[PDB]
Each structure stands twice: as structure tokens, then as C-alpha cells.
Amino acid sequence: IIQRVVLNSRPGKNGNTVAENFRVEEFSLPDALNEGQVQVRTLYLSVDPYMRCKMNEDTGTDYLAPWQLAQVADGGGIGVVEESKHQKLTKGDFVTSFYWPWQTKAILDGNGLEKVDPQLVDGHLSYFLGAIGMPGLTSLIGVQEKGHISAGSNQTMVVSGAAGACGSLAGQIGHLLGCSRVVGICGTQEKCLFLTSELGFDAAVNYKTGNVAEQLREACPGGVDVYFDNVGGDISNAVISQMNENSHIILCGQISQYSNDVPYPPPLPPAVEAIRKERNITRERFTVLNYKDKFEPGILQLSQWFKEGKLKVKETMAKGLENMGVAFQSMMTGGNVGKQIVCIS
Numbered sequence: 001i002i003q004r005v006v007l008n009s010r011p012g013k014n015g016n017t018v019a020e021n022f023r024v025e026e027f028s029l030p031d032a033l034n035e036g037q038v039q040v041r042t043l044y045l046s047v048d049p050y051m052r053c054k055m056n057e058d059t060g061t062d063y064l065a066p067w068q069l070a071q072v073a074d075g076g077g078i079g080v081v082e083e084s085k086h087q088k089l090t091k092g093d094f095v096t097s098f099y100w101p102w103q104t105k106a107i108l109d110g111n112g113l114e115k116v117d118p119q120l121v122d123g124h125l126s127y128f129l130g131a132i133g134m135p136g137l138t139s140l141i142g143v144q145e146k147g148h149i150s151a152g153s154n155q156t157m158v159v160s161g162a163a164g165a166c167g168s169l170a171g172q173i174g175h176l177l178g179c180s181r182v183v184g185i186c187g188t189q190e191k192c193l194f195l196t197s198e199l200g201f202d203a204a205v206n207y208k209t210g211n212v213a214e215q216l217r218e219a220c221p222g223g224v225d226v227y228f229d230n231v232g233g234d235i236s237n238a239v240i241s242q243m244n245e246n247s248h249i250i251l252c253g254q255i256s257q258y259s260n261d262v263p264y265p266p267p268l269p270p271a272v273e274a275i276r277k278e279r280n281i282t283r284e285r286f287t288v289l290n291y292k293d294k295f296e297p298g299i300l301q302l303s304q305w306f307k308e309g310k311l312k313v314k315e316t317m318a319k320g321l322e323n324m325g326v327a328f329q330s331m332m333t334g335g336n337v338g339k340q341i342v343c344i345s
């Protein structure tokens with residue numbers, strides 16, 4: 001009856017993922033719930049860049065454990081309760097977890113699940129894995145805490161990985177919080193058009209064209225005061241070179257390095273480091289799990305905006321548990337616009 005996806009092989013610390021890294025298998029769910037458990041039917045599962053690290057024997061992060069071979073993978077999920085021997089939850093209840101196993105159905109611990117209210121997302125439950133969830137909180141809290149945005153101050157925000165989930169939301173949050181100019185950098189023209197025609201970014205820079213330096217100059221004459229960074233690498237050495245004094249880098253992620261033998265908090269190149277030092281550019285580690293008491297208000301704020309249509313939510317949806325592998329790989333190589341999600345039932 002139940003299908004589950006396990007990690008079949010690892011790509012090596014310096015390898016690129018293949019769909020085949022994951023494998024589907026069938027298993028029998030125990031038909032009896034012991035005290036405290038709930039049986040849930042999986043509705044949606046998330047795939048996210050941090051999972052590339054969990055495919056390594058060593059994740060390089062002390063707060064992410066590696067996945068083991070032949071064992072079921074896991075991550076952000078949203079499902080519906082079917083049977084429940086736990087008081088706070090009953091049939092039809094919608095619950096979520098960041099440790100949801102990649103299974104059609106599961107028997108989880110009631111204390112490990114949080115019930116979500118369909119109203120906050122206009123019924124689109126998959127949003128709780130994105131804009132109205134971890135990714136949106138990362139963009140909102142990242143900006144509110146490391147952004148030093150001052151309404152009317154007339155700052156310019158550069159957002160990398162701008163057509164991804166965190167990027168598309170931050171650029172928009174950027175505007176709503178006071179920045180007057182927001183420019184996104186992404187890997188392709190159609191993504192660029194999405195940023196300016198649907199999200200409202202003032203400009204887009206296609207880095208596949210090959211002259212990020214120059215495009216940036218032109219799109220940013222006046223320097224960069226805020227850089228929501230999702231990619232790191234050359235792209236970042238370029239936004240930084242053009243940042244102004246006392247500006248800030250929200251160090252959200254560095255996806256360009258994930259498949260290279262590289263310590264997540266990599267250090268800027270000597271010359272680039274020199275410039276950061278001179279203009280006094282704040283570049284501090286940012287991990288959203290460190291701001292837990294800011295989640296409910298962040299949730300209420302993001303929901304509010306979404307509900308007023310002030311915050312546009314875009315997603316790319318794949319279908320079926322047997323396609324976790326390919327949806328994960330596809331996202332890591334840019335096949336998604338917005339949050340990558342996989343529909344499970």
C-alpha cells in the first residue's frame with residue numbers, strides 16, 4: 001500500500017545529483033496506533049537546496065544530520081490526519097513538519113506535528129511549505145533582522161536567486177519594507193521577465209549573459225545598499241564590489257557551492273574581502289531556526305500581505321512520490337520558478 005523514498009546513493013561531496021540518488025519502495029504501515037500517535041496522509045512534500053548537504057556522509061552543518069543509505073528521506077511536509085490517538089489532533093486536521101518522511105502515509109508522533117489553518121493560505125495548503133512557511137519566514141526575518149532597511153531612505157536592494165522561493169519573496173518584501181529600488185539576478189530571460197512583469201522588481205539581471213558586473217552597473221547606478229544573497233560565488237563577488245558603505249548582506253544561502261567541497265560559511269576572496277572591510281559591509285551568518293519567537297508574527301505578517309494580494313506566491317509543481325529525485329535535481333539546476341513542490345496525493 002505505502003510507497004517511500006530512500007536515499008539510494010550519494011553523489012560524493014563534489015558530485016552533481018542524479019534522479020537515481022533516490023529510490024522508491026513499498027512497505028506495510030502498522031495498522032495500529034499506539035498511545036500518542038497519528039496516522040497521516042501526505043499531501044505535499046518540499047524539496048530544498050539544504051537537502052544537497054544531507055546527501056553527504058557529512059553535512060558540514062552541525063544542525064542537519066546526513067541521510068543514511070537505504071533509509072527513508074524526510075523534510076518539510078503537509079498532510080491530513082486520518083486516525084489519531086493524540087488529543088490535540090483529529091481526522092481531517094491539516095498538519096505540517098520539517099521532519100516529514102517521504103512516504104504516501106505515515107504514523108507520526110502527535111507532539112511532532114503542528115496543525116495549520118487553511119484560512120491563512122486561501123486554501124492552498126502547499127503555501128505552508130513556502131511563502132507562508134519556512135522559506136517566507138527566512139526572507140521576511142532575514143530582511144527585518146539583517147536588512148537595516150529604513151522606509152523612505154531610498155535604498156537599492158540586489159537579490160540573487162531572485163526567481164526562486166526565498167528570492168522572489170524577499171525582493172517583494174524588500175519593496176513593502178521601504179526600499180525604493182529592487183533588482184533581482186537570475187539564470188534566464190524568462191525568469192527575468194517574471195521578476196519585472198509579475199513581481200514588480202524594478203530590474204532583473206540575467207547572469208547567463210555573462211556580464212553581471214556591467215549589467216549591474218547599469219541597473220544599479222547608485223550602488224547597492226542591501227544584498228539578499230542566496231547564491232554566493234562570482235555572482236556575489238560582483239554585487240559586493242558594487243555595494244556602498246555601511247550596507248548589508250543578508251547571508252541567506254550560497255547555492256553555487258553546494259555541490260563543491262566547500263565549508264558553508266565560505267570566506268569572500270581576499271580582494272572582495274578587502275572591499276567589504278573598507279565600506280563597512282555587514283555580512284553575518286543567518287539561520288532562520290535561530291529566530292523562532294519571530295515565527296508567529298512573521299506568519300501573521302506574511303499571511304496578511306498574501307491575503308491582500310500584496311505578496312505574490314509562485315510555485316513549480318511536480319507530481320508523485322516517485323518523482324522526488326527528479327524534482328530535487330531539477331530545482332538544484334534551476335528548473336523551477338518560485339518554490340519547488342511535489343504533490344503527493
Ligand SMILES: NC(=O)C1=CN([C@@H]2O[C@H](COP(=O)(O)OP(=O)(O)OC[C@H]3O[C@@H](n4cnc5c(N)ncnc54)[C@H](OP(=O)(O)O)[C@@H]3O)[C@@H](O)[C@H]2O)C=CC1
Binds near residue numbers: 049230253337339
Ligand atoms: N538561511 C536560512 O535559514 C535559509 C536559507 N536558504 C537558502 O536560500 C537559498 C535559496 O533557497 P530556495 O528559495 O529554497 O531555493 P530556490 O527556490 O531559489 O531554488 C534554487 C535556485 O538556485 C538557482 N541556482 C542553482 N545553481 C545556481 C548556481 N550555480 N548559481 C546561481 N544560481 C543557482 C536556480 O535559479 P536560476 O535559474 O536563477 O539559476 C534555482 O532555481 C539557498 O541557498 C538556501 O540554502 C533557504 C531556506 C532557509
